[PDB]
Symmetry: C2
Subunit: 89 residues, 2 copies
């Protein structure tokens, strides 16, 4: 209704982030999603469980789809609770 | 003993990765650690619990330290078990 049409698949929804995660801590963690990330909105997550949802708007569909893949791959393989990162002595 | 001195802090240890995670699945998930990543070795993790350790060798200390920060920030904030990523409708 008057608004420019939104480009399709340029914005990700990331739901169930930590309840007290700060905007600056989120943007530090999202840095590797690359220079395509334009804006971030952080709200309380809908539903019974505490959390936040982040709305991540990219400058292209290509930047957004790269970011979506990256997040999903990290989530499905690097999120082990006993994963430990250190300098190799 | 004959070997060129290793550069200091150019190699990360990532311990406690999933036991059956493949080399190709690890390298797909590590893609955002950026073009500094040169070589990856994947072994069984030492100790009582199942896992793998990945030895990640970077072309500079700058590439390695960026990669270490990125992994640690992702781990401490994006690893929630109910984190859900979708296209914003």
């Amino acid at each position: 209704s008057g608004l420019v049409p939104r480009g399709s698949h340029m914005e990700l929804s990331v739901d169930g982030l930590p309840p007290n995660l700060t905007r600056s801590a989120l943007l530090l963690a999202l840095q590797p999603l690359g220079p395509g990330l334009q804006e971030a909105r952080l709200l309380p997550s809908p539903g019974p469980a505490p959390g936040q949802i982040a709305l991540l708007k990219f400058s292209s569909h290509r930047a957004a789809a790269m970011a979506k893949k990256a997040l999903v791959e990290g989530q499905s393989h690097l999120c082990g609770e006993q994963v430990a990162v250190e300098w190799l002595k």
